[model samples]
Target: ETVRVRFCPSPTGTPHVGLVRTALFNWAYARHTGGTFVFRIEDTDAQRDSEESYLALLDALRWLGLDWDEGPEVGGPYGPYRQSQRAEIYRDVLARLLAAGEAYHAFSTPEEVEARHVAAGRNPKLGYDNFDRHLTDAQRAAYLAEGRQPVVRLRMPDDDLAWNDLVRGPVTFAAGSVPDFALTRASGDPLYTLVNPCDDALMKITHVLRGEDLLPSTPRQLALHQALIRIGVAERIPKFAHLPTVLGEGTKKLSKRDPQSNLFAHRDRGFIPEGLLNYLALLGWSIADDHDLFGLDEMVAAFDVADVNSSPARFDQKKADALNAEHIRMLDVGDFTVRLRDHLDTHGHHIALDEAAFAAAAELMQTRIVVLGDAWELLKFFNDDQYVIDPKAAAKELGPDGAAVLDAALAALTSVTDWTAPLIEAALKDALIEGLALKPRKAFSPIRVAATGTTVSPPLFESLELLGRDRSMQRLRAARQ
Candidate 1:
């Protein structure tokens, strides 16, 4: 069977990590199976959804390279993929379900419904008593006189709801465990319970993959889908896979309020799409027993929703950094250099350096940086006016004999006939280490601090060459004086 999966998100807040992971999983599954990847927008709640957030959703998927075969800007056979635009479609389906007796018109308000439960000597929390499922014409007329509007609801079947979930395997909910759920509010506006499975049926989506938290709603959706098939609106129910939760600090669900939950924040912090994408893939699914890192292409080649672990995967900050660092190291030097420049542009690290110079400096930083954020600090020393020594490194390395070492470096570099790394290296070694009989570590401490503004920097000789003979001697003399 040709697989078709959809990643539907409500445009509300900043794109969350869990949301991105769902999109990634669905997209990888679609790509792997050579099927259609539908990116749908569920913007039914006008009060919560915003155009800014909708734009952000599109940008987020584009940034992560998760292209959808249908929906939004790239439309397909099933579109106006946004639920807001599919009002007429949902209205039509809502009417059909009511006509087929698959759903009913309910005039029960929450307070009255709960009162009925309490009158029956039952807990109000037990939910609706389905009293509205059979109402007399006179009772409905009284409700109309009382200004009560009907909220459409689905009629659930009296049987166990069960499905072979692609991720969790067999999942079952007993009869009556799921009561008749609302398909629409009193306003006649369709609820998620209705529009959700409605669109999937119309679009012919073959699979429904989402967070585990939404698992409880599956039975209600399944019952409604069966009605759709009976009403001649759907051919078959889409398969479902409830993904494992992504936990944070403790066993707490990863909160959208958490700083780490922002996918854009990670991007701004220099997380290359591939680096973050690879890390996200390992959240609940592993490509191999021994492997921890794999490219997106490699992941697509082997992705299987059935293989995903149902256990929650905690987001590890240190592990995220470690994995990202490995991916950064794996990048080709030229690609790394280009992406570093992009990071600088996106993060507002604006500078007035030529391409050749920036590339040259970025080349030296390739191996030293864990994230591109690390680049700004290590490479800032290249800018003479912006240069400021790390106070911690200065306090440690620029101790008692620091001034003397700088003076020695100044004299040796000034006498160099050829302004090259090797010659400058030889000159410094002879003047400070050999002639002064100082240890190599001791000899270079102050010089490294003076020239690069830190004890740890690119190779002292190489940095000196890039700094040029004049700036090198001046920086050394500036520290000495």
Candidate 2:
């Protein structure tokens, strides 16, 4: 088996975490089986979709390194991957389906359908009673004479619809539970119900991996697939795995309205692709029982659709940050530096210090930071001229006793020839710890506050080394008074 999978997203708004999670799973599955990964854009909704969103979808996948074997910008034997560009294909398929009695015309309007349900004492919400399924030619012609255009609806099988789901196991929908659904607008524009299944068939997708929200539509699509097969447009029904929903703070599924749900927003807030991908993969699938952290290769090697959990996964922001921090820490100094630089530049932050000085500060900050942008807060004091002393830190560490300590510390440093972390540490220790008989914490607190402008910062001696002797002593002398 080729194990063909697809990541087809409708361009509507900003790409959200839920959509990215679906894409990740599909990509992982393809990589695991060495199968084809196809990317298709479902942009049939002209009112909502835009060129900007279409480009963003492509860019988002590229940024995450989830390269597809066939997709936009990259052509394949399947040819144009966009649904909007395949209108004629759907038109031809729709004609074949109607000619073969697989689909029929639906003329019941919203008000009329509701009236029929109310007359029968049934809930009006019970959609599409299939009242138009057996309309005689004369009745259809009479309605057509009155200018009542009919929507094309596929005829669902009378028996139960069932499939062995990739994630949730065997699932079944009763025969009468799902009514025939429209495949095209009255004016002949193809709806997603027709275009989505039709393209999947044409693309020869073997596995349909998507979110659980679409589970209810599975029976409808399955019915359509059988119709397409009967009409000679499709060869087989693709196996489907409806992934669990990714919930937010409450019981509801994550929405695009939520700021954190935005994929690019997380990236902007300093989530590396590897870190984010790893966290996303854990939403409903785990690599092992004991471990949560793994790289792409590890995930690809171990990933199995059967192993996916059917339970909805909560989007715990705190856990995501912790995971990202671990990935950040896993990066070597050189690699982390490059990533940090790109992140800073991407977010419009200016690097004030030279490479060597900034990198020296970053070495101390590697384990301390949870995100790349966090390095800014620690390293800014070295280069930011507008740096200000925290009032609380100043008052707590620069009290009368602290001022005297700073005075002695400046004196000790005035004549030191070697300018390094060891020399800096020794001068302050001798002046404040030994000469004044002060504790190490008390000795370094005032010095740390003066140099870094905050009570908490990188190690004092190493920071001073990066700051250079002249700048360090200048700040110390200024703070002494």
363-456: candidate 2 lDDT, tens digit per residue: 7877998777787777778765747899899888888888788889889988778898888888888888899998898889999988989998
The lDDT per prediction is 0.87, 0.87
Q: Which 10 consecutive positions of candidate 2 have the poorest summed lDDT?
A: 43-52
lDDT of 1 by residue, 40-119 (tens): 88888865448889989889999988888999888999889988898999999998998998998898888998999888
- My TM-score estimates for the predictions, one after another, are 0.96, 0.96
lDDT of 1 at 86: 89
Off by over 4 Å in 1: 351-353, 390-400
How large an RMSD does model 2 have? 1.6
What TM-score, to 2 decimals, does candidate 1 have?
Answer: 0.96
